[PDB]
Amino acid sequence: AIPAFHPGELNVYSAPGDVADVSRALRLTGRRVMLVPTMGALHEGHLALVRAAKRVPGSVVVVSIFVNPMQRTPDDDLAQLRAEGVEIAFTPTTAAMYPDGLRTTVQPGPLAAELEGGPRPTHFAGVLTVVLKLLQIVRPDRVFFGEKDYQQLVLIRQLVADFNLDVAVVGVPTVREADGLAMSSRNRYLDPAQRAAAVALSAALTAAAHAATAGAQAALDAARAVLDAAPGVAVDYLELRDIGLGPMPLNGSGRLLVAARLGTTRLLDNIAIEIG
Amino acid sequence: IPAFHPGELNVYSAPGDVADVSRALRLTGRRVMLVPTMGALHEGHLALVRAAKRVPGSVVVVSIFVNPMQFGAGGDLDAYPRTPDDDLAQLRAEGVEIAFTPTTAAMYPDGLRTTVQPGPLAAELEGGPRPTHFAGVLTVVLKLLQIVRPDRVFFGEKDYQQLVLIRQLVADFNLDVAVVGVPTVREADGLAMSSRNRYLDPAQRAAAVALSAALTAAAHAATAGAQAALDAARAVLDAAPGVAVDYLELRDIGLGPMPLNGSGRLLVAARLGTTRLLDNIAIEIGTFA
Ligand SMILES: O=C(O)[C@@H]1COc2ccccc2O1
Ligand SMILES: O=C(O)[C@@H]1COc2ccccc2O1
Structure with missing residues (x-):
């Protein structure tokens, strides 16, 4: 039996299987699921990702909030999403996301060693791993990322092409x-x-x-x-x-x-x- | 989608064609079963095909791809058995409706770029002296699951360490697919x-x-x-x-x-x-x- 989803309100889920079930059910009803991954502490830059996601016809907007250790204001973040008319926030624990520790991970190509990967040589492995997981959990039609982290965005598009992921990556100015x-x-x-x-x-x-x-x-x-x-x-x-x-x-x-x-x-x- | 003739064996080489046909089948209620192989098929493989067939409403996809990434330099790759005609004849005989036979170029257009890194189980037993062997297997299996998007994916217990690492992959990347081991x-x-x-x-x-x-x-x-x-x-x-x-x-x-x-x-x-x-x-x- 599918978890409860209330149209036009903020529905919060912490369990991956729950968000997975709701998303699958929404897609079968003709919604298009848009994913906006964040590490919380939301500002206008995040809201711009939100707004781009909202203006796809038939969109339902998933905002994930998760501080990734391999790479916070809870009720405030949530009130911003409520005020934007976002219908799903996905707020998992570290244990829900990594229930068997760090075991299988994504190894990025050579671009992950340059530029930002100079001072942080494992940073992008962590980001690609967490993004791959969110994509499989939520199965969005489109996933939105800001251009401010340009190298990150490029690495994500390599992830998507290289692993034949069926999602459109959208870069927002x-x-x-x-x-x-x-x-x-x-x-x-x-x-x-x-x-x-x-x-x-x-x-x-x-x-x-x-x-x-x-x-x-x-x-x-x-x-x-x-x-x-x-x-x-x-x-x-x-x-x-x-x-x-x-x-x-x-x-x-x-x-x-x-x-x-x-x-x-x-x-x-x-x-x-x-x-x- | 490209053509799909039911009750017959449809061979697709382009990842795009099998992905489209797979999606269409799933959007009309059939349940896509994937059996990944390196060809040179024998009765151990046909047992995987039969387990897949027996799943109600199933359509069976068998992939055949000799994945260069899981081989070590030093001749193993050139020495692997290739018997495509026999392979496809067996699949026809078993009533398989889909063979996916991609090119190396279609699978590796950017060479080895983004890849899967297995857990420490991949450094032991078969991977001890072949330390990149399982990264190659997990990378191609991830790609095949994203292309075909089956409900279930079938593997023999003979390559038991590989089966276990595959279950790791699936749990760790939250893949929505059931892994079936066959004796x-x-x-x-x-x-x-x-x-x-x-x-x-x-x-x-x-x-x-x-x-x-x-x-x-x-x-x-x-x-x-x-x-x-x-x-x-x-x-x-x-x-x-x-x-x-x-x-x-x-x-x-x-x-x-x-x-x-x-x-x-x-x-x-x-x-x-x-x-x-x-x-x-x-x-x-x-x-x-
Ligand atoms: O909070 C953010 O801006 C970051 C930006 O990019 C992210 C990538 C993966 C997971 C979360 C992410 O959120
Ligand atoms: O043909 C085989 O025995 C193997 C069975 O194991 C495989 C794992 C990944 C990709 C292809 C595979 O085929």
Whole structure:
């Protein structure tokens, strides 16, 4: 007997089998199941993923909330989802998700060792493992991820292609504060000087995107100049790549990515670039 | 979907074609059974096909793919038996409606990129000297399950360690599929059927009976305990001319970090000339606990 689902309200499930049963039953009634994976502490960036998911006709929206140890405000997160008209939150325990410990896992391809995988060499294995599991639990038609974690998003699309997963991956543009700073729960840690200097990341990227009519080197030099004008911003990398994160082609579409440390806080940003 | 003629054998090579046809069958109430194989089919495989057939409303998909990722460099891959015509004739005879025969290029367009890493069980027994062997198997089995999306997936108990790791895969990645183990089919003398058996000359074929002899001896000696069971198996193997034992181990049924209780599985692997054979049996210790 299928678990109780109440249309038009927030239905919370902690058991994987429960969310699995409700989702399967909803899909057979002609709903299209959309998955939005989060680690809770929700902000506007998450709500933008929510809104994209909601505007697919016949959608029912699953927001998972789960702090993944291989890679929190409960009632607040839940009230945000309620206010967005999300119908399912999936809130499992670590024991429900990992009932036999870490045993079989996903091993990402070589891209997981670069860029973010430099300081965190096992981070992406953890993320791919947890995403693969959420996909199998919920079986969504579409899964939504923000572009702010661009390398993550690329790795997810490799997971999906490589394991023949039958789901559409949707990347949603970065939601920014008014001065351009990419939204992230880490932004709250920045003191005023840091918060003011942090704008250099988005400013450098957008400057590069416009300098790019003058080519790749102009674009990288424009970005570096802007980063160079900021105090207390330790750049770990600034790299132009193709959109799949291979080597930048002589012209065409690319992606410029940056990561930097302000005090103890690590920030990231990235932007589409068109060369020429 | 591409064409699907029922009551007949439909052969698809493109993952997209079998996935579409599979989905359509499932959207109209049939229950898709998957039997994954490396071809060179024999009666051990047909027992898997018959178990699948007997599931009501079933449509059976047999895949045939010699997966290069689970082989070690050094000739094993080029030496594997390929008999496609016989394979497909047997499936026709069994009333299988779907054969999935993908290309290496269709399965590995990006080479080895995203892959499955098994638990530590994959580093032991068969994986000890072949440490990437089970990553290859679990990767292709994951992909076949995502392409075909069966309700149930069938495997022989002969490759028992592989069956166990597959159940691990399925539990650990929350796959919505039931894994059915099917008992080993045996020659009249006891020899576990395997595509490898054709590689035994008549002498080796005569000697090979020692594996199953040792295991069933041990299963009956087991009333007297684990040591008696193991010593019986070992003595039988010691009396076999030309059998080189790789391992003989008694484990818990999960093969795992639990000590052996009253129910176990006894596993053997051995070389006759260059041919490596495996077999295993259920074992009940003492009372039969
Ligand atoms: O809370 C978030 O923004 C992150 C972003 O990406 C995620 C990927 C897998 C599982 C949860 C995830 O949530
Ligand atoms: O043909 C066989 O014996 C094997 C049986 O085990 C297999 C496991 C994964 C993929 C194919 C397989 O076929």
